[PDB]
Amino acid sequence: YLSQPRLTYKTVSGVNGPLVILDHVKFPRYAEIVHLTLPDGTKRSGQVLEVSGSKAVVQVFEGTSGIDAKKTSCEFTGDILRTPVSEDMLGRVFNGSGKPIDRGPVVLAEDFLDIMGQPINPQCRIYPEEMIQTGISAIDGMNSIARGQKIPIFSAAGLPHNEIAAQICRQAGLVKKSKDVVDYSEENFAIVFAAMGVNMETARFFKSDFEENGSMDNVCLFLNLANDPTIERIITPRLALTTAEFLAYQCEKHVLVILTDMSSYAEALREVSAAREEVPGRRGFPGYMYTDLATIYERAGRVEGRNGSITQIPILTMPNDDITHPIPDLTGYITEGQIYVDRQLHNRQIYPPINVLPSLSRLMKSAIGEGMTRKDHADVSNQLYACYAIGKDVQAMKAVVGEEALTSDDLLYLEFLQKFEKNFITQGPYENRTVYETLDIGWQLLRIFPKEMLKRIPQSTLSEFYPR
Amino acid sequence: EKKEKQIEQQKKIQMSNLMNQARLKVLRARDDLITDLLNEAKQRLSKVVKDTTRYQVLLDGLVLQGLYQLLEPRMIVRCRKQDFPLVKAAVQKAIPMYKIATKKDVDVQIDQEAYLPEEIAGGVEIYNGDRKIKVSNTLESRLDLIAQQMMPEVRGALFGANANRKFLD
Amino acid sequence: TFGYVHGVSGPVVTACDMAGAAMYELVRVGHSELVGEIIRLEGDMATIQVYEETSGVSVGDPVLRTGKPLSVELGPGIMGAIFDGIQRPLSDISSQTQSIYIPRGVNVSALSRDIKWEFIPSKNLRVGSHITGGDIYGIVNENSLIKHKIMLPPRNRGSVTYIAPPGNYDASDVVLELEFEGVKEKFSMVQVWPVRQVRPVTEKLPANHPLLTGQRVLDALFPCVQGGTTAIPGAFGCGKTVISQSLSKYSNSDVIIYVGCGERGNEMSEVLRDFPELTMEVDGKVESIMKRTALVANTSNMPVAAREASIYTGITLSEYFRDMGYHVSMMADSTSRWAEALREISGRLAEMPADSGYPAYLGARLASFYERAGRVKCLGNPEREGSVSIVGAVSPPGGDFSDPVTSATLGIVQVFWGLDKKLAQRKHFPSVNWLISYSKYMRALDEYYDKHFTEFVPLRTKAKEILQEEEDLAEIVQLVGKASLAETDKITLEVAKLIKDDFLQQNGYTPYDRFCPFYKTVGMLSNMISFYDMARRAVETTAQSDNKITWSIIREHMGEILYKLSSMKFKDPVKDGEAKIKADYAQLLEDMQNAFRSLE
Amino acid sequence: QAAMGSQGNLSAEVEQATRRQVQGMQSSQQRNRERVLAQLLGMVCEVRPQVHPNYRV
């Protein structure tokens, strides 16, 4: 492959903010990586941006600070950024650029892969079949997450979305105990976490919690602190996703990708687009942003002939609780389903504050069924949703109508509302519930009514649990 | 119950920390092994430097690489002091190869004013007329480049294939 | 004449320093051969726009000099396979590569050069006869359902010189050769046509035949016409396959062409099984419909220009197979995805944002692709005729009917089948609104209806009036309590209910209620409305004359008749003869007449 | 007290495991280092110079 010596340049025809412009460059190449040596011996990486004739431009990752017009070395790698990927990197923590920070060694590469990856042939796609249990009752009981169902989570600043994600990570797993507990030991499940735009406190908390849980034999972590250069915030997702594609389609595993704080990701992309001297588009964001998020999210799913899969769970915030803002608009277009949180539930000291009224799920219809799970999920979830909706309406009714005008069924609706809230929604920081356990809790809740009010459940399945 | 679960949590965190330190120590030992291998490779190159028959051919190749890459009317070649006549013969035989391969007129000058440091195991550098564009073809740098380029194949040969690598691509 | 590439502001790059050549030409860059479009020229310079990624291209890499604009190959074998926007045979690419990810610059034709085909010429023309563009010249037996005719491309004529004898040949073998004035031309099984133009036709004939849809709902109500244009909103959970499958199985069209944008593999696999499952027994057998149809679609990761060119590739394929002398139906799904593709293209050209990023020529492009439609008289010796229909599914952002695109599409289209999620929540399928849906093609269909039925138009107008009046009266009966009103009004409400529960509904999981013949629907509606007419007249007369008959009396006396009206839908014409069904309905009508007479 | 016994035993277990792993890796690596070294040297000695493919006149 590469056998030619590496070239160095001492030419600096100018600078403009993060850019460095130079000339007399012999046959440069776009997206070519560059190393810079400062007068004080400091090293700084960068990427080529604009090429023309002999002139070339390079964006420095570490910012242009104290770059002399003469005493500067500029070394051209002669290739593009390549990820040294290996399966044994599980349990490690890297920064945005991939350099170790967990006091471990440089990744002894198993194979070098293109960071920009490659799109998947749409013919070679297998539809999701079965579901993954994430340990969160408030999500699992009423809203399944199939293998490869890109379900985002919408939140706002100040809510504990990060803590919810941490619990999801430290409690996730599979339901292969359905056939045999002894057969469950053949686990092939992994998690890759990508913390971006995360401040010191939350990054350190993620580190501490993951380190304490002890499940890092199946967790590979990427951390990008706020102080790091903005340009690395846009390369970190590529690194994490390249690792995920490798670990899935070459080692045949089931991988849960979590990316955090896509709003900072979008801010970083805005930064780069502004640095590129391009006119802004709608709401000051680049036009091509739809293509960008598409090439981020679309790389997740199943492939024919392989026993492996991806599930991707991005997290993002809503500026000023604006669902029509471009960031959720494009996310909702690209992805399937939506999960929300609601500020009042958090204000009432209810954790996790997951609102089931606006929760939506597409692939739930086939993510759940007989054989791989029980015959008692769709009916139970639909009954819970309808009963909660009528309970909310009845609580509203009682607000003004009066307690003296209530009926027995309406008292029953209030009781269902309060019990559902205090038991099913509220879980706690570490109370990991299984799917069957949450179903049993749901049945215990439904027991308050007679069988008449539970119309949504056919009598053949009522006979299973109702007479208890 | 709080005390008991605190004890359970403390014991579990102790297992997790001990297991991480074990894994990290194993990876450290492997890294030290690899660095020892690179050091042996360096000293093997240093031993192979001595033989003055293939070394002339190697220097001819290095000079040809520098000429073919820089591609400029004025060229300045720099090497170690003790190999001066050897590089002189190399450039003299190399100039016809350039003048036929590229079909250009170029002038080459050997920089006898400054010398490479004595610590350099062996190699050459070449500069333009204004000393602004440089390329180094040093043996140590070449070794580093090739080692980092073929690092995955080295392990793949040494420490056995990967059980879970069901498909290479 | 060599690479002078630049950097990018997005996923697209430019170059220059090349010979003079016409713009809108697709030229390939580099050894990996990335496709890009000539746009702007300044002297010897010429900017380009590659669609794939730009990473890794140096300055000076070769510029492959083509000589054509964006074009699509046309010919036999297109049916049965799947293609992207650039017309790349993805299944065959997977087979050849034995790899998962799309390789860059796959230089394989849409059709291979290794499969033989049976050819038969016109068997009437001889060497030396005169030919002109459009004149058929062969016929291919692709499969046992459709035969793919072969003609000369447009802008060709002269005296024949060579007619191949029939046999097994591939596309690389020249089959026809002729001598024009001063030159001579050779033609093979495949022809290439520029995307950015319209194929010529002798004229256009006004559309006058109703498009056949299996479901009696949205056919007897708000009919579509073959060769028309229509809009159907579509969203998650409301159902788009409920119409795609219906037009793929229960319709008179000869070919379906499904164009997609931003889709998943679910639809591809489900439809590739739906073709061998939900099948037509035209010859008495079950057969895959994939051999009849062709699927084209892209996903969100694909290049934006490819996403924009996918619809054009679809419609030019549609026009080619419409020139054949057939009926084609184009499902142009996700006009919203098309619109965002256009916005993404315009974003990099620094065009003025007119309305929410949309270019000024959005309405122009909208009108221009909806223009390419209708029943037409094709160019050829034997006077070929056929039609191409388009169905453009709208996708409002959260149901807001205020998009520039949606408003313009509403302006252009003629039929509209409003779709709801509330009805699917109410457990009523199929989901039609019956109030915001409309049809404007009734005036043309008057001739056909008068020629065949002579009752559908009065009966439909009566049904519409009754439904609207019931919707008006729903509020008054809400303020009265739905327990007291005039008998005439009550009976009006009752027949509106009747029409709701036994006429305006159809079950897709019941084998015998997946297809309602149009004559069966007409007979049902006539029977119901005659029953209502007689009841209304009886009550109105007896109100003033003697013994005012109330609906309680009517319903109790005639409860068996309401049972028979409800059970009229269980006829299953698949197993039960047409004449038998007519005799049964006529006997029911006579029984109703005698029952009414005994009442009064 | 049981916890003290258990953590002592587990520390012994992990120490034994890492010792066995490093010993096995050394026994494996000391077998064929020379051959791979000679392969890498054999590539290093080669040069095969040539012009950039993109150049022309």
Is the CB of C56 inside 8 Å of chain D's CB atoms?
no
Cα→Cα distances D18→A212, A332, B19, C186, D7, Å: 21, 49, 10, 77, 17
Cα separation, C576 vs A23, in Å, equals 85
What distance in Å separates residue A85's CA from the closest CA in chain D? 21
Q: Considering only CB atoms, which chain D residues are within 8 Å of C58?
A: 54
| 3-state DSSP assignment of residue C162 | strand
Of C6, C301, C344, the CB nearest to A288: C344
Cα separation, C315 vs C318, in Å, equals 5
CATH number of A1-468: 3.40.50.12240
User: Crossing angle for the helix pair C456-480 and C442-452, nearest 10 degrees?
Assistant: 120
Cα dihedral A425, A429, A434, A435, rounded to 10, equals 30
Quick one: tokens of C83?
């293609």
Resolution in A: 4.5
In chain A, count of helices (H) and strands (E)? 13, 16
Strands (E) across C249-384 are located at 255-261, 294-298, 327-332, 374-377
A355 phi/psi in degrees, rounded to 5: -90, 125
Is the CB of A468 inside 8 Å of chain B's CB atoms?
no
Cα→Cα distances C585→A316, C117, C511, Å: 62, 51, 21
DSSP C359-375: -TTHHHHHHHHHHS-EE
- C45 CB neighbour count, 10 Å cutoff: 13
Is the CB of D4 inside 8 Å of chain B's CB atoms?
no
Asked if the Cβ–Cβ distance from C61 to D54 is below 8 Å, we say yes
Dihedral (CA of A238, A242, A243, A248) sign: positive
Whose tokens are 């333009």? That residue is B128
Q: Considering only CB atoms, which chain B residues are within 8 Å of A5?
A: 65-66, 69, 135-137, 141-142
B136 phi/psi in degrees, rounded to 5: -105, 130
Q: Considering only CB atoms, which chain C residues are within 8 Å of D56?
A: 2
Buried b (16+ CB within 10 A) or exposed e, C306-324: bbbbbbbbbbbbbbbbbbb
User: Crossing angle for the helix pair A326-334 and A262-275, nearest 10 degrees?
Assistant: 110
Asked if the Cβ–Cβ distance from A6 to B27 is below 8 Å, we say no
| Pairing of the two strands C176-179 and C157-163 | antiparallel
- In sequence order, the β-bridge partners of residue B125 are B78, B136
Instruction: For an interface test with C, give the residue of D51, D54, D55, D57 to mutate (most C CBs within 10 A).
Output: D54
Note whether A125 and C264 are within 8 A (CB).
yes
Of C64, C65, C47, nearest to C9 by C-alpha is C47
Of B9, B15, B137, the CB nearest to A5: B137
Q: In what order do the strands lie in the sheet with A55-60?
A: A14-16, A19-22, A55-60, A43-52, A33-37, A73-76, A7-9, B133-136, B125-127, B74-78, B107-110
- Asked whether the bond before C430 is cis by omega within 30 degrees of 0, the reply is yes
Within A105-219, residue ranges assigned H as helices are: 137-140, 161-171, 200-213
Asked if the Cβ–Cβ distance from A3 to D54 is below 8 Å, we say no
Asked if the Cβ–Cβ distance from B16 to A211 is below 8 Å, we say yes
Of B18, B30, B158, the CB nearest to D11: B18
Quick one: tokens of A192?
């890759």
- C151 CB neighbour count, 10 Å cutoff: 22
Note whether A85 and A65 are within 8 A (CB).
no
Asked if the Cβ–Cβ distance from B37 to D37 is below 8 Å, we say yes
Cα separation, A340 vs A321, in Å, equals 11
| Pairing of the two strands C294-298 and C327-332 | unpaired
- C65 CB neighbour count, 10 Å cutoff: 12
| Pairing of the two strands C176-179 and B125-127 | unpaired
Is the CB of A4 inside 8 Å of chain B's CB atoms?
yes
List the chains bordering chain D where 3 or more Cβ pairs fall under 8 Å: A, B, C
Is the CB of D12 inside 8 Å of chain B's CB atoms?
no
Asked if the Cβ–Cβ distance from B54 to D43 is below 8 Å, we say no
Note whether A291 and C52 are within 8 A (CB).
no
In chain B, count of helices (H) and strands (E)? 5, 4
| A-D C-beta contacts closer than 8 Å | 3
Of A358, A289, A348, nearest to A321 by C-alpha is A358
Is the CB of A460 inside 8 Å of chain C's CB atoms?
no
Is the CB of C58 inside 8 Å of chain D's CB atoms?
yes
Note whether A262 and A153 are within 8 A (CB).
no
The identity of residue A135, as a single letter, is G
Asked if the Cβ–Cβ distance from B17 to A211 is below 8 Å, we say yes
Nearest CA in chain A to D46: A3
Residues 6 or more apart whose Cβ sits within 8 Å of residue C419 = C232, C233, C234, C235, C238, C239, C431, C432, C433
- Whether C180 has a binding-site annotation, put simply, is no
Nearest CA in chain A to C8: A50
Quick one: tokens of C489?
């009004």
- In sequence order, the β-bridge partners of residue C392 are C231, C332
Of A238, A194, A222, nearest to A81 by C-alpha is A238
Is the CB of A27 inside 8 Å of chain D's CB atoms?
yes
Cα separation, C353 vs A303, in Å, equals 40
Dihedral (CA of C178, C180, C182, C185) sign: negative
| Pairing of the two strands A254-259 and A189-198 | parallel
Buried b (16+ CB within 10 A) or exposed e, C217-239: bbbbbbbbbbbbbbbbbbbeebb
Note whether A174 and A372 are within 8 A (CB).
no
Whose tokens are 């390249």? That residue is A242
Quick one: tokens of A42?
């400091």
Asked if the Cβ–Cβ distance from B58 to D37 is below 8 Å, we say no
In chain C, count of helices (H) and strands (E)? 15, 23
Cα separation, C132 vs C397, in Å, equals 50
Note whether A236 and A109 are within 8 A (CB).
no
Cα→Cα distances B1→A228, A432, B7, C47, Å: 43, 18, 10, 74
Residues 6 or more apart whose Cβ sits within 8 Å of residue A110 = A84, A85, A86, A87, A88, B152, B155, B156, B162
Asked if the Cβ–Cβ distance from D3 to B11 is below 8 Å, we say yes
Q: Considering only CB atoms, which chain D residues are within 8 Å of B149?
A: none
What distance in Å separates residue D1's CA from the closest CA in chain A? 23
| C-D C-beta contacts closer than 8 Å | 6
Q: Characterise D52 by phi-psi region: left (phi > 0), alpha (psi -120 to 50), beta (else).
A: beta
Q: In what order do the strands lie in the sheet with C167-169?
A: C148-151, C136-140, C117-119, C167-169
H-run or E-run covering A398: helix A378-401
**In angstroms, how far is CA A196 from the centroid of its own chain?**
11
Note whether C449 and C457 are within 8 A (CB).
yes
Is the CB of D52 inside 8 Å of chain A's CB atoms?
yes
What distance in Å separates residue D10's CA from the closest CA in chain B? 8
User: Crossing angle for the helix pair D33-45 and B139-149, nearest 10 degrees?
Assistant: 120
DSSP C481: T
Cα dihedral B22, B25, B31, B33, rounded to 10, equals -100
Buried b (16+ CB within 10 A) or exposed e, B12-49: eeeebebbbebbbeebeebeebbeebeeebbebbeebe
Quick one: tokens of A340?
């929300």
Is the CB of D10 inside 8 Å of chain B's CB atoms?
yes
Note whether B29 and D22 are within 8 A (CB).
yes
What distance in Å separates residue A231's CA from the closest CA in chain C? 15
Q: Characterise C255 by phi-psi region: left (phi > 0), alpha (psi -120 to 50), beta (else).
A: beta
- Asked whether the bond before A314 is cis by omega within 30 degrees of 0, the reply is no
Asked if the Cβ–Cβ distance from A27 to D48 is below 8 Å, we say no
H-run or E-run covering A254: strand A254-259
C73 phi/psi in degrees, rounded to 5: -75, 145
Cα separation, D40 vs D32, in Å, equals 13
Query: CA angle, corner A279, sides to A275 and A280, nearest 5?
Result: 90
What distance in Å separates residue D14's CA from the closest CA in chain B? 7
List the chains bordering chain B where 3 or more Cβ pairs fall under 8 Å: A, D
Cα separation, C598 vs C404, in Å, equals 61
| 3-state DSSP assignment of residue D28 | helix
If interface means Cβ-Cβ distance under 8 Å, which residues of chain D face chain C? 54-56
| Pairing of the two strands A19-22 and A14-16 | antiparallel
Of A345, A347, A341, nearest to A359 by C-alpha is A341
Expressed in angstroms, the distance from the first to the final Cα of chain D is 85
A203 phi/psi in degrees, rounded to 5: -60, -45
What distance in Å separates residue B13's CA from the closest CA in chain A? 5
- Whether C238 has a binding-site annotation, put simply, is yes
Residues 6 or more apart whose Cβ sits within 8 Å of residue C90 = A121, A122, A123, C82, C83, C84
Residues 6 or more apart whose Cβ sits within 8 Å of residue C36 = C12, C13, C15, C26, C27, C28, C29, C48, C49, C50, C51
Cα separation, A189 vs A167, in Å, equals 16
Quick one: tokens of B127?
């500069």
Size of chain C in residues: 600
Q: Considering only CB atoms, which chain A residues are within 8 Å of D54?
A: 27
Whose tokens are 């409003």? That residue is C418
Expressed in angstroms, the distance from the first to the final Cα of chain C is 96
- In sequence order, the β-bridge partners of residue A83 are A113
Note whether C587 and C568 are within 8 A (CB).
no
- C335 CB neighbour count, 10 Å cutoff: 22
In chain D, count of helices (H) and strands (E)? 2, 0
Of A4, A427, C150, C509, nearest to B146 by C-alpha is A4
Of D35, D18, D41, nearest to B158 by C-alpha is D35
Dihedral (CA of B20, B26, B27, B32) sign: positive
H-run or E-run covering A48: strand A43-52
- Whether C236 has a binding-site annotation, put simply, is yes
Quick one: tokens of A421?
């809230």
| 3-state DSSP assignment of residue A229 | coil
What distance in Å separates residue A216's CA from the closest CA in chain D? 16
B31 phi/psi in degrees, rounded to 5: -65, -40
Asked if the Cβ–Cβ distance from A3 to D52 is below 8 Å, we say no
| 3-state DSSP assignment of residue A79 | coil
User: Crossing angle for the helix pair C487-502 and C518-544, nearest 10 degrees?
Assistant: 170
Q: In what order do the strands lie in the sheet with C176-179?
A: C130-132, C157-163, C176-179, C184-187
Quick one: tokens of C309?
């060119």
Cα separation, C402 vs C394, in Å, equals 12
H-run or E-run covering A327: helix A326-334
DSSP C345-412: HHHHTT----BTTB-TTHHHHHHHHHHS-EEEE-SSTT--EEEEEEEEEE--TTS-TT-HHHHHHHHH
Whose tokens are 């492997």? That residue is B30
What distance in Å separates residue A251's CA from the closest CA in chain B? 5
| Pairing of the two strands A111-114 and A55-60 | unpaired
Cα separation, C461 vs C418, in Å, equals 19
Within C413-558, residue ranges assigned H as helices are: 422-425, 442-452, 456-480, 487-502, 518-544, 551-557
Dihedral (CA of A153, A159, A162, A164) sign: negative
Asked if the Cβ–Cβ distance from A27 to D54 is below 8 Å, we say yes
What distance in Å separates residue C422's CA from the closest CA in chain A? 14
Cα separation, A360 vs A451, in Å, equals 27
Query: Maximum distance among all alpha carbons in chain C?
Result: 102
Whose tokens are 């192979």? That residue is B48
Whose tokens are 């319209």? That residue is C198
